[PDB]
């Protein structure tokens, strides 16, 4: 798809946006690609993960949610609308985008359109509130109202599909068609007004069911099972791990670039025994003022070497001025970039690009000449 290597190499607009974002990559790209003449594909061959991260920083989007449920007032009342909320309103509800297309560029501007929508009956209907005739609504948005009702039947036209027999409730009701028993009373039937027609709460029940169905079905895009469902997982056998087991041999080769008999061993040990039993005079450890001087001299030379090495170890301060230090830093940066490209093309080892490696080699020679 769009995340493949060649797509990231060929996406010039994404690379342009990444350069507009980054700051040190300005200096690197300016002093390598602009001046020394690297191919852009060569420069972006080693920075595929950075391009992919910048792509995934903006290409991903939030999941659908009830955006009109979040919009609540706070005499003056204020509501805040983010552009992400506007996009969620457009995605979750096609009727609002339909009104936006033929109302905003034509007659009245965007905030007037949103105020008219929030003061309309359509906002009360899509939120799930009971529609009342005493409310004025808005005379511009309400012409879309029946059209939105059209959308609802088209919603049924994309939602009414046959289901499995595990949860088939239409087969539950129609298990026998000749049920003519006691009619369910008014507690088990939808509520009606004084004239006998429905009060309209079944309308908002169907509306919230339709909204949930639309949210679930929006996930299904490009972005025998009944036996598996009815089987009890506990009564089956537990999972046995199939992890591999290794055994390590310690028959390694010895590192490559005097025999003593037991009688010399034993007589040396006996000499140690008689030297230990008689008098273990500790004062003999004191040196004779010459080997002590030699040992002290060796230790002072070693610690002088170690102190000279470890006297000094954010970059450290230097005697170089800022301009010449920065020139040396950019020359080192472009030389290292050339070296990295040369080595990755050299050890990649395709003959067809091998001559291109020669070009880098010439640039490497120029790098030497540059120094």
């Amino acid at each position: 798809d769009s995340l493949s290597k060649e797509k990231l190499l060929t996406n010039l607009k994404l690379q342009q946006s990444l350069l507009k974002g980054n700051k040190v990559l300005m200096k690197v790209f300016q002093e390598t690609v602009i001046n020394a003449g690297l191919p852009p594909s060569e420069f972006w061959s080693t920075r595929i993960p950075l391009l992919r991260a910048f792509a995934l920083s903006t290409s991903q989007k939030v999941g659908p949610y009830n955006v009109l449920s979040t919009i609540k007032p706070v005499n003056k009342v204020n509501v805040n609308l983010s552009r992400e909320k506007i996009l969620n309103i457009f995605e979750n509800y096609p009727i609002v985008k339909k009104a936006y297309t033929d109302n905003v560029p034509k007659n009245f501007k965007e905030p007037e359109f949103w105020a008219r929508f929030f003061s309309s009956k359509l906002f009360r209907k899509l939120r799930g509130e009971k529609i009342m005739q005493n409310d004025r609504g808005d005379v511009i948005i309400d012409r879309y109202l029946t059209l939105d009702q059209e959308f609802d039947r088209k919603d049924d036209d994309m939602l009414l599909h046959p289901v499995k027999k595990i949860i088939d409730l239409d087969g539950n009701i129609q298990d026998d068609p000749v049920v003519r028993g006691n009619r369910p009373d008014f507690t088990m039937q939808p509520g009606v007004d004084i004239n006998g027609n429905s009060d309209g709460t079944v309308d908002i029940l169907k509306g919230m069911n339709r909204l949930s169905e639309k949210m679930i079905m929006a996930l299904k895009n490009e972005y025998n099972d009944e036996r598996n469902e009815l089987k009890i997982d506990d009564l089956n056998e537990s999972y046995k791990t199939n992890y591999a087991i290794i055994h390590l041999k310690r028959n390694a080769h010895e590192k490559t670039t005097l025999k003593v008999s037991n009688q010399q061993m034993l007589q040396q040990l006996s000499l140690v025994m008689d030297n230990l039993i008689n008098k273990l005079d500790l004062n003999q450890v004191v040196p004779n003022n010459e080997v002590s001087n030699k040992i002290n001299k060796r230790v002072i030379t070693a610690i002088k070497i170690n102190a000279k090495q470890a006297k000094h170890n954010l970059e450290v301060k230097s005697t170089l001025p800022i301009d010449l230090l920065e020139s040396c830093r950019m020359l080192h940066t472009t030389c290292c970039e050339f070296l990295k490209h040369f080595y990755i093309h050299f050890q990649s080892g395709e003959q067809k690009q091998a001559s291109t490696v020669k070009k880098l080699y010439n640039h490497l020679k120029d790098c030497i000449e540059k120094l």
């Binding site: 342009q16 350069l19 790209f29 300016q30 690609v33 602009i34």
Partner: peptide, 21 residues
């Protein structure tokens, strides 16, 4: 200033886009 740098950058991309097309 980075304005001259990005202007030269956009000039280079314009020249490149002229080159492959």
């Amino acid at each position: 200033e980075e304005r001259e740098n990005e202007k030269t950058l956009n000039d280079y991309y314009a020249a490149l886009a002229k080159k492959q097309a």
